[model samples]
Target: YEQDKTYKITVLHTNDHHGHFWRNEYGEYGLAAQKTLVDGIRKEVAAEGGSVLLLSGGDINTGVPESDLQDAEPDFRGMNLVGYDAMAIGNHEFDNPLTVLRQQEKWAKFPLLSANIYQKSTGERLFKPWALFKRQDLKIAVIGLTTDDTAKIGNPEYFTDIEFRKPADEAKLVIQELQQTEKPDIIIAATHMGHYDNGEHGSNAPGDVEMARALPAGSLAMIVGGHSQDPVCMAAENKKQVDYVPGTPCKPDQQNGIWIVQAHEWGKYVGRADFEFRNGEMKMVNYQLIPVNLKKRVLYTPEIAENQQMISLLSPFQNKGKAQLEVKIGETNGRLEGDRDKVRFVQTNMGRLILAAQMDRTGADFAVMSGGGIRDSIEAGDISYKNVLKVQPFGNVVVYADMTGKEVIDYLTAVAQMKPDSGAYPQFANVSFVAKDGKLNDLKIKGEPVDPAKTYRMATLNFNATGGDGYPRLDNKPGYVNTGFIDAEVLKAYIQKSSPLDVSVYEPKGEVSWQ
Candidate 1:
């Protein structure tokens, strides 16, 4: 190979953005600044006689006020303006419903790629498996893979007609398809699946590390990953061991070999990596986790035209949301806390508030919400619809089921198994239990000992009721009913009618004992 003959492509990527289109103190990590960085990088790469592909590891929904309120339209439009080459489907894409996702699929200028997620009966893919990009006589294929945990970690009802296949297996098939059909010179896996540890990704599904190992070595050139919201950039050989064919030389920089990277969540950084190719093999020549610093407003002004357009497009929805969100509904006498990490381990005041609201509104025997459903905490002050919306952004409805006390206890046991750190942790109302080392005992409902034989009406978010967060036993359980009331509104109504909400009842006690 002649030293002078080379091909290069720069891949700029982000993942798990959720809906952070507004700037925070975290160095202007909104869509505007993100777009600027991406655009600037694209121009720079182009000027250097190379190409750039803007990619996203999905989860572009349900984060901030504007996007959550309007179903991520503004963010969608902003991404369209940013010109993504392709994106993998994150589980949260199904948070609203299949119909909502369909609208987003239509709105996106680029293809929503997911080789694993598919139609249930037809066994057909829900999204395109891969997209081929050709630049300077080089063929590059970007294949998408989603976490199989989407089935249990998201609103399962939305996916009842769909299926999330094992990403590793699906990736193998897609890679074969790309190799046979597309004959691409480079193969990239832009995936929404992520890694954690100890047989658990919190989603109870395959993560990036696991998926990477599962794929045969040499099948993928690069893996752009997301969903854990962690930052990572490492060559395949250094990061994790994969089964490479004997006598095959592993090249960290080349496209014919493997490498993986993911930017942390909330659009804080753009993962920029350049690949240089020789004789159809690609290698990473340079890499950077470029900060999306809005502090450099002057530096990014050139790319702000699209940013201005995004602001213009979002103004109406933004204004309306602000006005509606700020209307005081009630005041919290004390803080009603529900941070994701906190609530998943111990019961919080916010959990009590939510459970009380759901149980009281539905007049059910008891109510519970998965800790994952509560997105934010409410401080000791006036509460607004906006606050409620922020806390319950997924828009899950209240659902109920009639179950024997034993069944209830069993469910509680399952919830216990997920505690100390799991999205499936249960926060309850009108119920109490002692849980330790994955065991539930001294269970009580309405301050009475739980009667195993007695039937009780249980209330929960539709997400949990439909088996999200690893609670498959709850799915379509006997006498199940979706109350069809927006979860946020239910909490809002409860807080309004029960103003200065009694903090005593919601206060944490010895309900769960995991230590």
Candidate 2:
């Protein structure tokens, strides 16, 4: 190499956005403000003759009502306005059907790359495996990988013809493809496969740490990842990150000479990694996880301002979603407790509300909702469609199954066993049982012990009936129905009908009592 010339490259990234196109009530972590920060960075780098590549760890679907209602149309347009170079396809990308995902791809200005997802029928890749870019004459390649766990947890209705292969092996093969074929000067993975510190990916598919460790050192420049949804800052070697505070120094994880970074979630922080490349070598110079108007209480000053152009583009979608939902739909006597900690461990008012909604809509003897599906709580007083949406943001369809009393017992056997502090934990209405040692006993429906000979109807979200949260897949079973009714809308209607919802009234008469 004759007197190699050095080039400055800045990489910016965020992940697990989950459809937060607008600012929160506190005016933090919205795409409009994110645009301002990123635009400033792009201009600053451009002024120095340096180049910038902004990537996303993906999961641009689900989470917020505005984005959910419009199928994330505004979020994609907002991302286009922010100039995302590329992104990995996340599991939540399967929350809707292929038609919707394809539309989302159209809405995005960047490539939605994923190497490990394929169509079973055609045996063809569903998205571009990798993308090659030239920055300042630097041949940069970014390969995308997603969690194979998607096969188990994603909406199974969408997976009938799709396969989520393990990404680790695919990552290596893609690297080989790049080295032998494209031979890019720099290779990085924009991944939604998560960053598990020290490769200790317990209960999760191997993530960027394991992927990096398996490859040769410097296999790629770095990995920008999401799904675990935490800021990938390291506390020490072979250690996970502690609770991260905004605007603090963050050290991205390094394994096998690879830097792994994830910028939390909801556009809260943008990860910037500055690097210099020369003589066939790449070196990271500086890194910072810059906060976007994050508040440390109400005490911190807001730095990044909202960009008007982006807001102008998104406000209509926002207003449309709000206009449909902002009307007071009902009133609640007290808080409907859907907080993660409460709902996942113990039955809460929110759980009963969901169960009643599902049961009423499907006319099922009982209903079940995965504890994890409920995202937030509703405060006491007037409730709106927006409030119900905040509680159930995934757009999971309300589905149900007809089962014999014996089958109901069998289904409850699996669901009631979902351990506490897990999203799989079952919250039910119109039924009760005593649970112990991972087994169901004294299970009763309609205030009577289930009769093995009789048939009963059961309701749940399509996500669960289709095997999300490890629930046994029942979509193919006889007497199963996908109502195509979204949970948020169902909950909204139920709240509207049962205005003045009294938490005490919906409480399970037959409790899931632990013996």
Candidate 3:
């Protein structure tokens, strides 16, 4: 009798962590808790004599206030502590300047990987394209791909000197090279691109399904994706987008022989997949999305001990930060709402307040706030700087642009026409418009009818002014100027001046009609 000749490799992956290190009061798992679970799995796999790889799919910045304020330092520290091998460069990685990204590279122990991002002035790769992991005779290669949508989604100034090429096209060349140069038993593409079933998840950028179908079948084994924050795990059989149903695991597509998976954003879950190799060919044996439910109490003493140690390390920063964040800045009257869903699609008092602050600060004829920029809302009470920061976490600067009424109307029309209700929906201050089945009507500025020929000065976030969240019409438009005032600080100053801030006065009333 001959023993079966086979080797097994386990992959542990995460994406879109977004600076969640401690478990929330609401019981959502944080990075520390996630570390506990990851370590346990690693121990189990090690005991089974299987090799494990820890990887991340990027977007580790611009979510929680602590990380955003500290330039994502805590997040980097946590990732370093957790021991990630490599990370894909998510679009948010460019939210700060190139200098900041370079600093992040230094802080992170793992390599920031992207094959397609190149310098515009000089054709040089921004990061290492891929990393090879070896265990005894078995070699596994992991390539990284960033979304091409970074061109429009991030601050344009940071990206002007850089070019992000299509990941699929870049993969074709990189995969071919890898096959010839470093022949590995398994190949994985860890990407910041999203996965979706209907169409492109957020932007027109190619997603995991598209990449899986485009890449040469045998060369690429697994694809771990991020950026839409949707959970997707499936095997590619017909190249269709995998419909992500949380908690229910979908079987792998054995026919197409490719596996794609993504953990939902913010350390809620860890994605796990195992592959078996026989004669240096790939065979995916098992896949699971291990949910690190923070709600559950620690079962093992080791996990409890690790959690306590992590808490001790992080508590000082978190406690001090919370004290400062909770300091009262002003007061809100009559419920200045800011729910993520409400602000994105419909008018809210918080949205109005943000745009109002921008317009007042710039002395613009009108102000437009991207609904996506308004992250959280505050109830009627004493408001804190933290509340304001949460509402406008991007630290976007106020920008001004001159546009004719028609141009503004056309821009709003485009925003309205977006299918599936995008975050690009316009929230107004001293300007109003109605969108009836995606057509613009009743456009007005300060209660007067908007004239297509008349010029109007507009104030908005730098993110929007530079083409973020699908506002390409405003990018580098004529008479554009950066005011250099941080959005949250502006809102803070505005609130302080107004004291008992009555946000109702600025709120849009029936201005947006998406029929």
Candidate 4:
């Protein structure tokens, strides 16, 4: 027999939003789409009559004109649009200089916490580890941790002044403090770490595993995580023996028993987990991840109206550079889809189209494009001047270089070898290659097998020319020359000549079902 008790706690969260603050056809998660999704979460939580905690796993910046616009400003206006309760300090949060990061923090209305990030100058903690909340007798503790891959994407200058610590050590300190001082009924950690320890996308934190291991006994309840951007939730009931010193006995894998959870990135889903307390101990009562889809739900129009008003407020600044942003010259014919993973694995039409554009700009016999260089795709029909800018967002410089036919082949082969590990494979015009099982094969240069020792003239972006896309083999190649020209500007100039591009510029020649 069981006694009936009613208690409901709900959490609404998003991570890696990246200025999907408004909706457009760009992709699934944008501003409008997120608004629709979050509205549903709010409605559901309200209807259920539960205490809800809305948290973001950091990365509140990047990926659109909006974020760029805010960063361009002395003040952060874009982040202000997003409403967050608590956010973990993401790696990209430090992508700019640390000073700018501090400035961005100043603009946040909610508390931003990072347990593991500290200033190297004084070895002192920079941000708070956890925040306290009270609902009835339930004093909830929410902690934060940033991903460890900050070193990769972040500028060294941003974090040359600080140091990131092991998540477990930081978690222990925070959990001990919360347990001793707060006496919280439940605890949750919000982090930008990965879902698992699979060596994926530079997440150095063992994440769920590490957090559960370091949590204080009977203190930590669950972990809400991000960064890797995969939707996952797991309960760890079995603990392995941890290795310890010779004199110390083996201990349970976890310092405290806790469950870890993470939702997919891009406002795609909201995770829900209900905890049941029996005799003052936590037990998993139920768990689910609710999908945030515009197609299925009704949006709270008033909020959108408010957001639109905000947009109008921002219109003057966003449009101040309209001439720089607009001024459409032509349209792209082929589906210029910028699929990075696809291009990394196999040559894509969009990849070839960009390379062709670069070749046309330099009047080179052939051209090469680094796979990572292409970000978005030109959708079919009516390409605007904005499309060209989107295709080459970095505003890179164009350069021409003379290479031996042999050197060119060597460079391609070295890049070919990197198909598995690098996104630097050069996209080319008048060239094609085969990739079988993720390995580059069937090397061809200008409709012929590339010769190992022949010299060939090439034109490419200045970034690629100077090892921007991992073309280290081309480093200091003889006869290197700087064209003193910008790639995007050259591309726009080229487009003005080839005005009104047909929708059939380039496309997959054969049936290729993308997995």
Best by lDDT: 2
What number of clashing residue pairs does each candidate have, in the order they appear?
Answer: 7, 1, 2, 27
What is the Cα-based lDDT of residue 337 in candidate 1? 87
Model 2 Cα lDDT, one tens digit per residue, 1-515? 12578888999999989888998877788999999999999999999988899999999887777787789999999999999999999887887888999999988889999999989999888899998888877789999988887766412557768898889899888999889998889999999887766786765577888989998998889999998788887788867667888877888888889888999988999999999888888899999899888886462435787899998999999999888688797998988888999888888888888888888767788888888998999888999887877887767888788788889888888888788889888888877778878777788887899999998988899899989999988877767765545688778877888887777886545477775
How displaced is residue 93 in candidate 1, in Å?
0.4
What are the TM-scores, per candidate, against the unseen true structure? 0.66, 0.73, 0.69, 0.58
> Which ten-residue region of model 4 has the weakest summed lDDT?
243-252
Any idea what lDDT model 4 has? 0.60
TM-score of 1: 0.66
Pairs of colliding residues, candidate 1? 194-208, 253-282, 253-283, 253-284, 254-282, 254-283, 255-282
Model 1 lDDT tens row, 197-256 = 322443246676666666777677788988766666433534422332212232322222
Ranking of all candidate structures by their TM-score, best first: 2, 3, 1, 4
Ordered by lDDT, highest first, the candidates read 2, 1, 3, 4
Those runs of model 2 whose alpha carbons end farther than 4 Å from true positions after fitting are 1-3, 299-302, 326-353, 356-384, 387-515
For all candidates in order, the CA lDDT equals 0.74, 0.85, 0.74, 0.60
**Candidate 4 per-residue C-alpha lDDT over 228-296 given as tens digits, one digit per residue, 9 for 90 to 100:** 565553233332222211112211122346665665655555566665643456676666655544332
Give candidate 4's error at residue 117 in angstroms. 1.1
